[PDB]
Amino acid sequence: GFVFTTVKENPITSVKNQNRAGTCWCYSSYSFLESELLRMGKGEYDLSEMFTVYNTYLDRADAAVRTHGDVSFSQGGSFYDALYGMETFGLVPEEEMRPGMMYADTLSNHTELSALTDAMVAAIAKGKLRKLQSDENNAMLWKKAVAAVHQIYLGVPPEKFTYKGKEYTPKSFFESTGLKASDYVSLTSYTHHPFYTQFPLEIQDNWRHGMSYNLPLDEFMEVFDNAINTGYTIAWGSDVSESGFTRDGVAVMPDDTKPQPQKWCTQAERQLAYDNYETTDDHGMQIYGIAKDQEGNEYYMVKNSWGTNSKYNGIWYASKAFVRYKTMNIVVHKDALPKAIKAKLGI
Amino acid sequence: GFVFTTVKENPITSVKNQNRAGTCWCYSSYSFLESELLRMGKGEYDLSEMFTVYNTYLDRADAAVRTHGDVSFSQGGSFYDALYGMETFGLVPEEEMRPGMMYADTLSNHTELSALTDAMVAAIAKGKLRKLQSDENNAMLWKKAVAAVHQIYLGVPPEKFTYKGKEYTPKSFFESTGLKASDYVSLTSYTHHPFYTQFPLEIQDNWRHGMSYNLPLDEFMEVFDNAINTGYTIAWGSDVSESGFTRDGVAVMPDDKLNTKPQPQKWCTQAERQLAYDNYETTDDHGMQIYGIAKDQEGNEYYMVKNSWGTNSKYNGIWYASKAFVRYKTMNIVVHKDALPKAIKAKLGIK
Amino acid sequence: GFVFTTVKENPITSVKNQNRAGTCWCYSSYSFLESELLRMGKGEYDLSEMFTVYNTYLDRADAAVRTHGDVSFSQGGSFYDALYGMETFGLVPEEEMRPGMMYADTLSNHTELSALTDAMVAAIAKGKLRKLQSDENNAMLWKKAVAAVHQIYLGVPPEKFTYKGKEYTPKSFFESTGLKASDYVSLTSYTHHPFYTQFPLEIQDNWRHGMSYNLPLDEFMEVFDNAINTGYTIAWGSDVSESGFTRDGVAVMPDDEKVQELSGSDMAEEKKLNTKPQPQKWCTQAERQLAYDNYETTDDHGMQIYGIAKDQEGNEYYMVKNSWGTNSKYNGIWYASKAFVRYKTMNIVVHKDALPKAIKAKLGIK
Amino acid sequence: GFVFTTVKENPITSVKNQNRAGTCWCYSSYSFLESELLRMGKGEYDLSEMFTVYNTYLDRADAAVRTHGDVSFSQGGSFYDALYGMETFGLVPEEEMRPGMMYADTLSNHTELSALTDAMVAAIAKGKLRKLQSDENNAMLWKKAVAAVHQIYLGVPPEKFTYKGKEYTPKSFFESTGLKASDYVSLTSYTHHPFYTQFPLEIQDNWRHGMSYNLPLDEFMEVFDNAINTGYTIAWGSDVSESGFTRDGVAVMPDKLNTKPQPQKWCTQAERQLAYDNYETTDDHGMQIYGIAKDQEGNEYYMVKNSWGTNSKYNGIWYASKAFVRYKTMNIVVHKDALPKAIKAKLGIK
Amino acid sequence: GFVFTTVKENPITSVKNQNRAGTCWCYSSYSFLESELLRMGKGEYDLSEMFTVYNTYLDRADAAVRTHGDVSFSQGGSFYDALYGMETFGLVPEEEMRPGMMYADTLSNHTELSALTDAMVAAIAKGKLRKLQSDENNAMLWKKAVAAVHQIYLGVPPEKFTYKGKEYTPKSFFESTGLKASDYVSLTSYTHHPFYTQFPLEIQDNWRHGMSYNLPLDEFMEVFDNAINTGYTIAWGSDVSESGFTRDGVAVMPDTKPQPQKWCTQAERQLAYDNYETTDDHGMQIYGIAKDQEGNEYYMVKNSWGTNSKYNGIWYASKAFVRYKTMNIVVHKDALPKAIKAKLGIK
Ligand SMILES: *CC(=O)[C@H](CC#C)NC(=O)CN
Ligand SMILES: *CC(=O)[C@H](CC#C)NC(=O)CN
Ligand SMILES: *CC(=O)[C@H](CC#C)NC(=O)CN
Ligand SMILES: *CC(=O)[C@H](CC#C)NC(=O)CN
Ligand SMILES: C#CC[C@H](NC(=O)CN)C(C)=O
Ligand SMILES: [K+]
Ligand SMILES: [K+]
Numbered sequence A: 001g002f003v004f005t006t007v008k009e010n011p012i013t014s015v016k017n018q019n020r021a022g023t024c025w026c027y028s029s030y031s032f033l034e035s036e037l038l039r040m041g042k043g044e045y046d047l048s049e050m051f052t053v054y055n056t057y058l059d060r061a062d063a064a065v066r067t068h069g070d071v072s073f074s075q076g077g078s079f080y081d082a083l084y085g086m087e088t089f090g091l092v093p094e095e096e097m098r099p100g101m102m103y104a105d106t107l108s109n110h111t112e113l114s115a116l117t118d119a120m121v122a123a124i125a126k127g128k129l130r131k132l133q134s135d136e137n138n139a140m141l142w143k144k145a146v147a148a149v150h151q152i153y154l155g156v157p158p159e160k161f162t163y164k165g166k167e168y169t170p171k172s173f174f175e176s177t178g179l180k181a182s183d184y185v186s187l188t189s190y191t192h193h194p195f196y197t198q199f200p201l202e203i204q205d206n207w208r209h210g211m212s213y214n215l216p217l218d219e220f221m222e223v224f225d226n227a228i229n230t231g232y233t234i235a236w237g238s239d240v241s242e243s244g245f246t247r248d249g250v251a252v253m254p255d256d257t258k259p260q261p262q263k264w265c266t267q268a269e270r271q272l273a274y275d276n277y278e279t280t281d282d283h284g285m286q287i288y289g290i291a292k293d294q295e296g297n298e299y300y301m302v303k304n305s306w307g308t309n310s311k312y313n314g315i316w317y318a319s320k321a322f323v324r325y326k327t328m329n330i331v332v333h334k335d336a337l338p339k340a341i342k343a344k345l346g347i
Numbered sequence B: 001g002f003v004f005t006t007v008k009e010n011p012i013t014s015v016k017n018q019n020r021a022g023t024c025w026c027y028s029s030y031s032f033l034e035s036e037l038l039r040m041g042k043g044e045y046d047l048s049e050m051f052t053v054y055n056t057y058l059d060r061a062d063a064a065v066r067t068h069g070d071v072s073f074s075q076g077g078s079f080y081d082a083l084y085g086m087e088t089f090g091l092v093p094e095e096e097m098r099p100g101m102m103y104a105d106t107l108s109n110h111t112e113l114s115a116l117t118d119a120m121v122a123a124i125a126k127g128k129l130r131k132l133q134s135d136e137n138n139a140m141l142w143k144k145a146v147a148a149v150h151q152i153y154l155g156v157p158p159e160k161f162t163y164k165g166k167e168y169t170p171k172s173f174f175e176s177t178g179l180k181a182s183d184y185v186s187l188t189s190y191t192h193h194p195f196y197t198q199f200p201l202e203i204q205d206n207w208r209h210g211m212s213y214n215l216p217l218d219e220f221m222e223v224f225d226n227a228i229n230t231g232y233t234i235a236w237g238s239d240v241s242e243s244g245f246t247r248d249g250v251a252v253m254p255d256d257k258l259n260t261k262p263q264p265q266k267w268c269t270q271a272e273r274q275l276a277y278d279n280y281e282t283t284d285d286h287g288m289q290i291y292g293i294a295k296d297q298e299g300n301e302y303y304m305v306k307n308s309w310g311t312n313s314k315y316n317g318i319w320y321a322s323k324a325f326v327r328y329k330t331m332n333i334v335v336h337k338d339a340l341p342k343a344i345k346a347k348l349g350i351k
Numbered sequence C: 001g002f003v004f005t006t007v008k009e010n011p012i013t014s015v016k017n018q019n020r021a022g023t024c025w026c027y028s029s030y031s032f033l034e035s036e037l038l039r040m041g042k043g044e045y046d047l048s049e050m051f052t053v054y055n056t057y058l059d060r061a062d063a064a065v066r067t068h069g070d071v072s073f074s075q076g077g078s079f080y081d082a083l084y085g086m087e088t089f090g091l092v093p094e095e096e097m098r099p100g101m102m103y104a105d106t107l108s109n110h111t112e113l114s115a116l117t118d119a120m121v122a123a124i125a126k127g128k129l130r131k132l133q134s135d136e137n138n139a140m141l142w143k144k145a146v147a148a149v150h151q152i153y154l155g156v157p158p159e160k161f162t163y164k165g166k167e168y169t170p171k172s173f174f175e176s177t178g179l180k181a182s183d184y185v186s187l188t189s190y191t192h193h194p195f196y197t198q199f200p201l202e203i204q205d206n207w208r209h210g211m212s213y214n215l216p217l218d219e220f221m222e223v224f225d226n227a228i229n230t231g232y233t234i235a236w237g238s239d240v241s242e243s244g245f246t247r248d249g250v251a252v253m254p255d256d257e258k259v260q261e262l263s264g265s266d267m268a269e270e271k272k273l274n275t276k277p278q279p280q281k282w283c284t285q286a287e288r289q290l291a292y293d294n295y296e297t298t299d300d301h302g303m304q305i306y307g308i309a310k311d312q313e314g315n316e317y318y319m320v321k322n323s324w325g326t327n328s329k330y331n332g333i334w335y336a337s338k339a340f341v342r343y344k345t346m347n348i349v350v351h352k353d354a355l356p357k358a359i360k361a362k363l364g365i366k
Numbered sequence D: 001g002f003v004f005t006t007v008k009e010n011p012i013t014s015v016k017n018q019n020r021a022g023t024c025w026c027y028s029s030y031s032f033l034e035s036e037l038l039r040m041g042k043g044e045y046d047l048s049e050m051f052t053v054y055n056t057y058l059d060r061a062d063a064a065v066r067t068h069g070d071v072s073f074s075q076g077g078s079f080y081d082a083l084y085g086m087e088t089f090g091l092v093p094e095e096e097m098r099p100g101m102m103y104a105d106t107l108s109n110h111t112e113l114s115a116l117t118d119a120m121v122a123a124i125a126k127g128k129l130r131k132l133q134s135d136e137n138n139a140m141l142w143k144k145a146v147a148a149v150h151q152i153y154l155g156v157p158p159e160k161f162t163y164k165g166k167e168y169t170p171k172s173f174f175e176s177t178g179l180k181a182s183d184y185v186s187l188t189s190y191t192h193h194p195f196y197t198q199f200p201l202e203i204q205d206n207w208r209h210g211m212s213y214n215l216p217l218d219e220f221m222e223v224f225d226n227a228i229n230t231g232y233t234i235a236w237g238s239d240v241s242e243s244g245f246t247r248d249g250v251a252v253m254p255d256k257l258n259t260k261p262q263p264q265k266w267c268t269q270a271e272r273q274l275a276y277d278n279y280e281t282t283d284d285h286g287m288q289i290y291g292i293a294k295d296q297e298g299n300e301y302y303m304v305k306n307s308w309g310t311n312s313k314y315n316g317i318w319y320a321s322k323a324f325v326r327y328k329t330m331n332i333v334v335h336k337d338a339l340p341k342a343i344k345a346k347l348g349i350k
Numbered sequence E: 001g002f003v004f005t006t007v008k009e010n011p012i013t014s015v016k017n018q019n020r021a022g023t024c025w026c027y028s029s030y031s032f033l034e035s036e037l038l039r040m041g042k043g044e045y046d047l048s049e050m051f052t053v054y055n056t057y058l059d060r061a062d063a064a065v066r067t068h069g070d071v072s073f074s075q076g077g078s079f080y081d082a083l084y085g086m087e088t089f090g091l092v093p094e095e096e097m098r099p100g101m102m103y104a105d106t107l108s109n110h111t112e113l114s115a116l117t118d119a120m121v122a123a124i125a126k127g128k129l130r131k132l133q134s135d136e137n138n139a140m141l142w143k144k145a146v147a148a149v150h151q152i153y154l155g156v157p158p159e160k161f162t163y164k165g166k167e168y169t170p171k172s173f174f175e176s177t178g179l180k181a182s183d184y185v186s187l188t189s190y191t192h193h194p195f196y197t198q199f200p201l202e203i204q205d206n207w208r209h210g211m212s213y214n215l216p217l218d219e220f221m222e223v224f225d226n227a228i229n230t231g232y233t234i235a236w237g238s239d240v241s242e243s244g245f246t247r248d249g250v251a252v253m254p255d256t257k258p259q260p261q262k263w264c265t266q267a268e269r270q271l272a273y274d275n276y277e278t279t280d281d282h283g284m285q286i287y288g289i290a291k292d293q294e295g296n297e298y299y300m301v302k303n304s305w306g307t308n309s310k311y312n313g314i315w316y317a318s319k320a321f322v323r324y325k326t327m328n329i330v331v332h333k334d335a336l337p338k339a340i341k342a343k344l345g346i347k
């Protein structure tokens, strides 16, 4: 079996449960940002995923309709969706917009909401309508319909609320927190773009076309350990549809249940897996620590959003070889970058 | 050409325009009900079609979902939809729900509303969902979604309103009128059911399965003249997808300038009428109101028909349908009980 | 395990097998009608399901074509299909139309018949034909084709036949039995219609739009015990797509919270939910309505309830005669707990005289 | 009828014919780029549309495969496709890749090529393959197949060629011209983004997500006249699916609608925004505006060089009224120095 | 269990692996042709299946386009495809075109090649194009495209080559071997055609409409034993979608151990062909006769699925199974009994 020993770990919040929704991008983004609030001495927070998920879907439907169905309308998203959301829509506390509250449950189940909204967006974006209807204020009626259905299944967004003695608006609550999206950068490592440049990752959930800095694979992994050792956490978006990532919580990349010698990939081998569909933008998580196994092979400690009903109560151990091979992109505070890597990027 | 002379005509309301919506069933039903209110000395009314159209679509979506997509969800309907609707939902005046008010228009255009709601109902009724979501009051969430989208395109139903100095609810306003759906019967003439019995017409827009009394074809046409001659109007449902039905205001069934001048008409048998209904040649296309009788130069008889396509036609929205066309292409009719002849009424078991 | 002891059960016929066909509505209707003939002192009968199944599909194809595909064309049906069928088409004995006789079998297998007829009806009802062809007597040609294909797979309906020494027609044989469709009523229990009224159940196999009397749930279950205790059987249409409905011959509605409370384990095969008697979930009228509204209770299967039995622990069960053959634990007999029947029943059909007098007065039956 | 009198017009090249293909984006871009070369004193060029069209489709096929079918694979494109293409793939003259040369024709007909390549990309991008094959050098095999089919219908890209006495490569020939994509900016006018900012236009053919500067509608129209009056031409992307846009060579926005001068509908910023939101203004056609003309009644028109050949009333030249351009323009591309100095400060272009 | 004892067997080559492609028709055809060369004193050969598979698909695409999609375009084939192919395209040795050579493998995997070419052929044969493009020499452009894609996944056909000391062309290498397709006949046994006549089997992979001689079932089985006893091997095309066909290396027709087999009549064999119970599934080579422990007869069958099976890729098919599930066979003339051979008129 596996016996792990923590080398260094940073403060995180309680593990949440996305349940039946493709909202891992928002649950992991807020797990990362909540660790940022603890790190900045602002206390522990429980930010509402459903608030940003609601507003993001409204924007994605607009993107799908404007591109006549080119932008797919689905439950997925990115870390930039939350970074854009906090500046554009703001933030609200979890209690204001609770998951499943509208269908008498406590966890998310968006299968029926998707079934209706997918059909609605497709009827507009991929239909034969030649003129979309609007009211006397030039407001689109289909946007009202899509927003109304989303509110019935996710809830009504509050315009004002009281939280811990203070009355807030979604934007003033975001300013209350003091986070700012300008202080966070997205990082990747691929060869179909020049190094030390910015490009938007060609993945379906990046319909906002958020940019990422391109780093060499070895310098890319240097940011991982530097972020943990400096007191930072990592928003980790990676492929988890591999034989090495199991249910138990161990994500390894063995060289073909126990520690085995791992296969350390080249920059070209990593590129081919991204080129041949073997590495896809599947899951978003948070890396908050480093650990070792019995044989000394390294691991990153990962906080998932699948509840606490696992061997390590919702904490997974991803080997450094697995992270080097299957990572799609990461988001960390710019200050977590090493000074040399940070100068190379033109920050 | 045609030169018509009125034999008898009964009071009707102004001609309305259904426009870009399949709501002819409601506009003709309210044209019939408004003439009924005039007939009983209650005055002129302008009832809101969009109110009944809104509530009917909500029920039709429920029928489609309960039957897992068997009941088609479309814009059509029947006269019974309005008779059932006034007793269940009530009535509101036109000013409380106007057509097109929600998309900066004055007439209906339900193409975008249909495109959304059809996709919504299909995602539920014909999808792969095995358990539909509900709140803590056991209210279906999909019904809230379908109702919300309908309100965005058709308007919000009023719960109370002021009309001519008095505050009403849709239920209390219907009671003002004094009409009763029990006092109206649906009549048809086919042979795939026994005569003088009741059966629901097997047409898509009869998803409520409202029943109709079956009469022989000759006795069926007797109700037409008896209703008009005694002072009643007829809610008329007929197939208008024939070469004889023209945009010039006339609807003839000529025997072989077939549609421009009066010609000898083909008077169908009961079997010939049955075949056209069996072989798709007679379908539930259009709903109108028959309110009068007219003659041509050569003495052939016509029914004066009030359409719902506006007034931009040869006779300002009025069609002249020959009795031969009406005998052949009528799907069903709805009249007050007292418009039937006493002998025919006794055969059907009415009181 | 389960140990059942009969409290009261009424005479039934042998258990039949529908096999590979969605004809449970007819087999259960005839299990009910055969029990009615035994109760009325008419003897044992073996009514031909394939005769009624043939004629019902012809009417269902006509409904699909007339409604331009709105009425779905499938193998299902209702109890009213048999009640309407015996008055319209009549009855013939089993030996005159046996299942599988046309493809060298003894049991039904209508997969190929459905594959052809579904495509035929759809080509007419959902096609782009604007005028269907007819002969010089105004008879529809597509109806001849659909009937011809049905006869090739099900057999030719007899116009005359000899049964036990006498020559019959399907109509005259039905009159011999002395049954009358007027003596049977359909009952249901839902809230989307007023109680003590009649409405047609909004289910696909009710394309004939037969009516059912609406009763409160407690009064609805009163007809079950009163019919069995007075000597009548019940045509039972119910949902069987539940975890409690097992292939072992039991149909239960266990309360998961209580079973896990009585379990030694916390809330976080071995649960034994359906293998032994457990505390049942006694649904409310609203809980029953929600399951019908949210697709959790659907018109799946038609069976016959003919008796009442209790287990070792005294819980009540309805004895159910299925149409899946006798290769089961109780040889084709199921024990359905009253909680399951109260929760998952779509509708039932019983003789009028099986109703309590008070329930009969509230509905207006004479 | 119409009788137009020119006010000012700038040098253009001969009118070409895109024919069957939906390559208007490349033909109009090269009409614009050829006018830029004349303006900068480099002479006339006849740039190969098929060379850039070939390389653009391979990039679009890769984008469709990477996004699992989200990026649509079709014949369309944008002006940025040519600006990116000349810097990435370079430029070759028309004689090195001619239209229709591979199927014994002289004009483009890409209906069969699209039928094959659309099915190929869809089988990869939207199929059920879970691992795409590659050779020993990690080169994707499907990319070889898509490129091979494109070469069979469009021609083989030259690796070296001789033009006017000197041997060139596609990269070296582009450097000879002296063009730079940095000297060209994309401009639009919409309100769903802040003014004087950059955003990618949400149209299918902008799959590269090229940015455009957002200007108020009145300042947007100021760039049109300033560019023409100072000697520049405009790459004009606009909606042509209107009743006012006729095949006779006129494009009007009437309030005999398109046969005589009539009062025009002067759209607001909101009216222009609504048409873009409700599908009434779509990225349909790319053309080049190179001059200004008169009505009999003094109304203003932009002289437009189309890419539909010369078999029209004005031999492939359109007159677009200033009201039509104000209402139906999606975006334009001009040299930076065609912008007024004040507008350049608001956008921050140096 | 089973214990088999060989009665008589003929020389064969090693078992090969088709791996992941429907090229069993060519691998078995060349197993038959290689055994044909051994009996004729010509030595051992390894003919390239990928060469014939490449050219056969080019002809099948032309057949699909000419019949506007009626002829299906798939990976399957027949024994006549190889007999026609060797006379039309010739023969090349294996190492000049190897499976997987183009995608860094050693065995075939044509799933991606099929996904592309199927879509290409369908776009032409079943599309709405009303005039297909051609060059100046009247050569079809779509044929160039389909051929180019096939070469990218299967390899470039050699036009000249050196083998064993001499330079050959596909003409000349086929002539070197000395085989002639006229010396090979296809045989079947059905009643929907008159006996002792020729008809093309109504199966999808017989799109070339190659003919087969129709024999009564008992005389059909006489050719099996006569071929083995006289020194010939049999190209065996048969249905393998039965419960009796196991991955353990035996093919029985029971009425793991020897059991009494069911002896089908001519009508029972015909019904299975009429009601889809016997379909053209697999092509193999019969090269011998064997007994089990209990003395009932078996045919020794050489498969093309590699050698990781209980009998190292070789199956034992009972004579009752072959009598029931055989679609057609190909043998040399002289493998036929003399009495049957006059009835068919072959001289
Ligand atoms: C006349 C109309 O609008 C409507 C359209 C349909 C279907 N027709 C009917 O409802 C007739 N049943
Ligand atoms: C039980 C059965 O055979 C049939 C299957 C189908 C469809 N179900 C019904 O008829 C439901 N009453
Ligand atoms: C104008 C043209 O050919 C093309 C249409 C297609 C495909 N349009 C564009 O490329 C710009 N939208
Ligand atoms: C045996 C095989 O691979 C192939 C199936 C496919 C595809 N079968 C044939 O080629 C002849 N039936
Ligand atoms: C829908 C869906 C899958 C989904 N993936 C993403 O959102 C992309 N990171 C998820 C977190 O479950
Ligand atoms: K949270
Ligand atoms: K993967």
Ligand SMILES: [K+]
Residues within 6 Å of the ligand: B016, B030, B046, B047, B048, B049, B094
């Ligand atoms: K009205």
Ligand SMILES: [K+]
Residues within 6 Å of the ligand: B239, B240, B241, B242, B280, B281, B282, B283
């Ligand atoms: K008609």
Ligand SMILES: [K+]
Residues within 6 Å of the ligand: C016, C030, C046, C047, C048, C049, C094
């Ligand atoms: K029976």
Ligand SMILES: [K+]
Residues within 6 Å of the ligand: C239, C240, C241, C242, C295, C296, C297, C298
């Ligand atoms: K169920």
Ligand SMILES: [K+]
Residues within 6 Å of the ligand: D016, D030, D046, D047, D048, D049, D094
């Ligand atoms: K050019």
Ligand SMILES: [K+]
Residues within 6 Å of the ligand: D239, D240, D241, D242, D279, D280, D281, D282
């Ligand atoms: K337009």
Ligand SMILES: [K+]
Residues within 6 Å of the ligand: E016, E030, E046, E047, E048, E049, E094
């Ligand atoms: K070989």
Ligand SMILES: [K+]
Residues within 6 Å of the ligand: E239, E240, E241, E242, E276, E277, E278, E279
């Ligand atoms: K088989």
